[PDB]
């Protein structure tokens, strides 16, 4: 199954450390996040919100970039990867109206998204989920997990990405910081 | 709402003329196709199959190709366009494992998908829906409609695409030919 649900509430595998409402409407503070590898028909009782998205095919990365990523990217659920962050992201209508070459040029040629991210591997494991096509309020659910040794480096990565050309088209963004239970 | 369902059965806006089971498991012959905007998980008891997909963002076309398409491509629902064809399509695992540059290279540089297609506009109107990400048995639901004057031209277009490098990666394909009621 390629579908995942993220339920903010009183159950889950991850404890919410803090929520930072970076841009646009935030998400209600909750105790934990419950991650399920399937769709949940409705938000459970007592839970505050549900996000969902699917794993999909590559949209921008070229073969040589995939080879570099696969050489170093770490697995999920490393014993030491006790910290994580869920970052839902929505991009603007202007972005989605652009053609494929226009979006690729912004994503890598101008912002060097993959090349920059590659510097912060293998410390940081990641997972990308898509959800605009499901009608969700966000466009992407991005997931990162790492050991505390890499907290400072991950903050530096965030600083670089938020300053990029790509991020000029980001319209809504929230950070849910997590600690593994 | 970007989700559409196609229910093969006894009711609907379109009458089935024939079903050509081009490649792989076919679709059971039915009387009509009913098209619904949104998702359904029931389908009337007199229905043989349901298909679903969503409209999404551009994946391969570049800006100059979009400009050429927009200059000539017709709208759906032309008074004269009383014939339609629904063509569900599934591509191989090998296709989906390829990177973005590799898939684009086959799609256009080698197969000339958009350049060939442009030759049959404005006669043929089209819609493209995606459904691999929904876990469906097909990957795409493609839709075409035209006046009878263009039936032979559309048959020619099919001939040319089925012989392309791109189509070497197609592993299931069906044609549901339809007439507007
Ligand atoms: C940590 C190292 C990172 C690496 C190696 C990395 C790599 C990538 C790659 C290769 C893609 C393209 C996938 C495709 O072609 O479909 C992608 C997509 C994306 N990533 Fe990252 N990334 C990293 C960090 C981040 C961070 C920190 C964020 C958010 C703050 C982020 C947000 C996104 C988004 C929103 C997309 C979707 C872009 C789109 O389809 O428009 N990534 N990432
Ligand atoms: C009639 C003229 C046609 C034109 C102008 C045309 C044009 C296009 C374009 C520009 C795309 C890329 C959309 C994107 O960038 O995401 C596309 C995708 C596609 N077309 Fe066509 N097309 C035509 C006919 C057909 C026919 C007759 C079929 C099937 C029998 C077909 C099957 C597909 C499929 C399956 C895709 C998705 C490709 C993929 O994502 O791998 N097209 N078409
Ligand atoms: O990512
Ligand atoms: O198409």
């Amino acid at each position: 199954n390629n579908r995942y649900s993220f339920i903010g509430g009183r159950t889950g595998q991850w404890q919410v450390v803090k929520i930072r409402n970076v841009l646009g409407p935030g998400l209600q503070l909750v105790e934990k996040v419950n991650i399920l590898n399937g769709a949940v028909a409705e938000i459970p009782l007592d839970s505050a919100w549900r996000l969902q998205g699917f794993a999909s095919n590559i949209r921008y990365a070229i073969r040589t970039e995939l080879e570099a990523l696969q050489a170093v990217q770490p697995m999920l659920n490393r014993a030491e990867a006790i910290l994580a962050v869920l970052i839902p992201i929505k991009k603007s209508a202007q972005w989605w109206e652009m053609a494929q070459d226009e979006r690729r040029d912004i994503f890598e040629r101008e912002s060097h998204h993959t090349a920059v991210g590659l510097e912060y591997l293998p410390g940081v494991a990641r997972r990308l989920l898509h959800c605009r096509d499901l009608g969700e309020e966000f466009d992407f659910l991005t997931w990162f997990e790492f050991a505390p040794e890499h907290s400072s480096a991950f903050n530096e990565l965030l600083l670089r990405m938020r300053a990029s050309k790509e991020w000029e088209y980001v319209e809504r963004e929230v950070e849910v910081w997590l600690k593994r239970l």
Side-chain angles (χ1 to χ4, degrees), chain A residues 3-142:
Chain A
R3 185 81 66 92
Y4 297 86
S5 299
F6 298 75
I7 302 169
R10 53 182 183 173
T11 53
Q13 311 94 329
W14 298 89
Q15 182 181 55
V16 177
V17 179
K18 71 181 180 186
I19 296 185
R20 187 193 295 266
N21 300 323
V22 176
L23 187 66
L27 291 175
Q28 179 180 326
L29 189 62
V30 294
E31 194 179 337
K32 303 170 189 173
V33 172
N34 189 13
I35 300 182
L36 304 168
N37 181 201
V40 302
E42 299 178 358
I43 306 170
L45 287 54
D46 204 327
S47 297
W49 41 259
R50 178 203 67 190
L51 309 170
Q52 63 175 335
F54 54 79
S56 195
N57 60 277
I58 289 291
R59 311 303 182 83
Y60 296 116
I62 71 174
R63 172 55 66 190
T64 52
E65 292 167 347
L66 286 187
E67 292 172 355
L69 294 163
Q70 294 169 356
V72 297
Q73 53 199 5
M75 69 185 288
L76 297 172
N77 309 307
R78 288 170 299 177
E80 72 268 19
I82 59 168
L83 303 183
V85 66
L86 171 67
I87 307 182
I89 287 165
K90 186 191 183 74
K91 290 185 182 191
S92 73
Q94 185 190 358
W95 169 264
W96 293 111
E97 295 164 6
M98 284 183 196
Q100 175 63 27
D101 60 328
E102 291 170 337
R103 282 177 272 100
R104 162 66 194 193
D105 287 337
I106 291 155
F107 177 78
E108 198 59 33
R109 187 183 301 264
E110 299 307 326
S111 305
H112 291 282
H113 186 127
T114 298
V116 167
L118 190 68
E119 293 181 48
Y120 298 87
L121 281 44
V124 179
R126 63 175 210 291
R127 189 73 182 277
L128 171 67
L129 301 174
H130 302 253
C131 53
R132 178 170 187 262
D133 294 314
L134 303 178
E136 289 283 302
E137 61 199 319
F138 295 99
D139 293 339
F140 308 102
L141 305 177
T142 67

